[PDB]
């Protein structure tokens, strides 16, 4: 998965609508008494 070995090498237009939807979610998100042994 990662390291000196690193055997994995691989995991357009459909990536546009997703990451533009992923960002707009992100700005929407930001905007002992009585106990004893």
């Amino acid at each position: 998965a990662f390291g000196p070995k690193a055997q994995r090498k691989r995991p357009l237009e459909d990536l546009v609508k997703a990451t533009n939807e992923d960002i707009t979610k992100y700005e929407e998100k930001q905007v002992s008494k009585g106990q004893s042994k």
Binding site: F2, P11, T19, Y26, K29
Partner: protein
């Protein structure tokens, strides 16, 4: 108890330090997706929390 806390204080140094890949930013999440493989990242840290 003192050894028992000794393992946890090392484990509390791991789970606090690593950058919590969900809800960082969808860019920093997604460089780490390609480079660090989100599945192996989230499983190994959840193994230590177990």
């Amino acid at each position: 108890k003192y050894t028992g806390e000794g393992f946890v204080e090392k484990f509390e140094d791991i789970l606090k330090g690593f950058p919590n890949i969900n809800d960082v930013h969808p860019f920093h999440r997604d460089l780490m997706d390609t480079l660090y493989e989100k599945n192996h990242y989230k499983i190994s840290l959840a193994a230590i929390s177990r």
